[PDB]
């Protein structure tokens, strides 16, 4: 070969001869050509740069010609509040009022153990639901676990929350959530960035090439 293409932009692919994944012919009258190698071409050109056309080469995979281009440019007292104006307790949202576990083995405990991990949760992954606070959304609220003995009213700035106004997220999948629950299961002087582009008419070596971005 007189001019081998640049080894960073040469890929190898076979021939199909019109045969699909099942092996049967779907496009007729193809097959038995010459051997080819695939060239990688920048068809996006989204990066805004300046370049010098180095050479115009031959590409067997397409009718036009390609061009090799080297690119030359491109701890304070928090407001602790002890006054609460009202307490709301989510005790009817389960839909059935029942006591809290720590003993007979129950159906719900069997179904919890059968679908649990291989080896509280209202944080980190999902956080506090917006529903709780739905009667009045723009109000600073402090969630807390309900205690058997009467609790304290001291509330620091870290323990008070308010969905701003931005939120008036991601999305789970019905059949692929169990797997995810299961743990997840300028350079130096000797270098030069170069790319392959589709050469235009009247574009020879030594010329300028621009990529422009929105202004």
């Amino acid at each position: 070969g007189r001019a081998r293409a640049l080894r960073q932009f040469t890929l190898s692919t076979g021939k199909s001869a019109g045969r699909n994944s099942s092996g049967r012919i779907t496009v007729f009258h193809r097959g038995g050509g010459s051997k080819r190698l695939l060239r990688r071409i920048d068809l996006k050109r989204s990066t805004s740069s300046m370049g010098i056309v180095e050479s115009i080469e031959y590409d067997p995979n397409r009718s036009s010609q390609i061009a090799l281009v080297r690119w030359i440019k491109g701890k304070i007292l928090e407001p602790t509040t002890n006054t609460i104006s009202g307490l709301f307790s989510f005790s009817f949202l389960p839909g059935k009022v029942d006591k809290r576990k720590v003993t007979k083995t129950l159906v719900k405990d069997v179904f919890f153990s059968a679908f649990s991990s291989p080896k509280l949760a209202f944080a980190s992954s999902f956080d506090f639901p917006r529903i709780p606070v739905a009667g009045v959304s723009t109000a600073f609220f402090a969630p807390r676990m309900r205690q058997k003995v009467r609790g304290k009213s001291t509330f620091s700035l870290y323990e008070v929350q308010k969905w701003r106004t931005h939120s008036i997220k991601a999305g789970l999948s019905w059949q692929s959530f169990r797997r995810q629950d299961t743990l997840g299961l300028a350079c130096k002087v000797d270098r030069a960035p170069v790319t392959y582009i589709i050469a235009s008419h009247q574009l020879e070596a030594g010329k300028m090439v621009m990529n422009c971005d929105w202004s």
Binding site: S85, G86, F90, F92, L93, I131, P132, A134, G135, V136
Partner: peptide
């Protein structure tokens, strides 16, 4: 999804009524 309305079932009606009562008292 935008929390502009809730279904008319008893738990959410009670929740909306009490929270609106507490805030609209102020």
């Amino acid at each position: 999804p935008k929390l502009l309305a809730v279904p008319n079932i008893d738990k959410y009606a009670h929740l909306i009524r009490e929270q609106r009562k507490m805030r609209n008292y102020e």
